[PDB]
Design a protein around this ligand. Structure first.
Ligand SMILES: Cn1c[n+]([C@@H]2O[C@H](COP(=O)(O)OP(=O)(O)OP(=O)(O)OC[C@H]3O[C@@H](n4ccc(N)nc4=O)[C@H](O)[C@@H]3O)[C@@H](O)[C@H]2O)c2nc(N)[nH]c(=O)c21
Length: 150
């Protein structure tokens, strides 16, 4: 029924349906204001799921850009979506450039006094089969807090 749900089905993504849906969502974000469009929220959640299995760089960059913007104004649903995309998507297909972004946004989340991102990162490490991942020294320190909860 909802365009996000059509777009998420088996070979259900079409460009004209997505372009229409996106534009309305982004239009309603500007008209009503950040964090005040529920249709925009459906797009954060479409992106979180879609990009796990049909990654596209430009769509990823808008997702990350718009969710980081929302997060600084105080609306964290997009960032929560972003962090799930990182944690579940990098488990499907590891991409070292996306992994570096994941580290950058997690260290930012933690420096803001939040734990949602840091826990998704720890959870990625517990579930992932990727080997010889390079973890930033700063982030390695913050994760060191969860070893005590062992
Ligand atoms: C099996 N599992 C558990 N975790 C992570 O480990 C910690 C403890 O897990 P849980 O207690 O069960 O969730 P919890 O209640 O604590 O918080 P939560 O709200 O659930 O965040 C997670 C949210 O992912 C959404 N969602 C769900 C299903 C799906 N297909 N997509 C989703 O996107 C959904 O919305 C969900 O709620 C949490 O950090 C949790 O994320 C994992 N992480 C990775 N990479 N892979 C995993 O196979 C895995």
């Amino acid at each position: 029924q909802h365009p996000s749900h059509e777009l998420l089905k088996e070979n259900g993504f079409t460009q004209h349906v997505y372009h229409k849906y996106r534009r309305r969502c982004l239009n309603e974000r500007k008209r009503l204001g950040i964090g005040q469009s529920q249709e925009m929220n459906t797009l954060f959640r479409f992106w979180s799921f879609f990009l796990r299995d049909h990654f596209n760089r430009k769509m990823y960059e808008e997702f990350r850009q718009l969710s980081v913007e929302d997060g600084k104004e105080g609306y964290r649903y997009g960032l929560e979506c972003l962090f799930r995309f990182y944690s579940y998507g990098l488990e499907r297909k590891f991409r070292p450039d996306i992994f570096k972004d994941f580290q950058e946004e997690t260290v930012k989340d933690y420096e803001a006094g939040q734990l949602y991102g840091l826990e998704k990162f720890w959870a990625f490490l517990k579930y992932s089969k990727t080997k010889n991942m390079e973890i930033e020294p700063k982030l390695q320190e913050h994760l060191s807090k969860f070893r005590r909860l062992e």
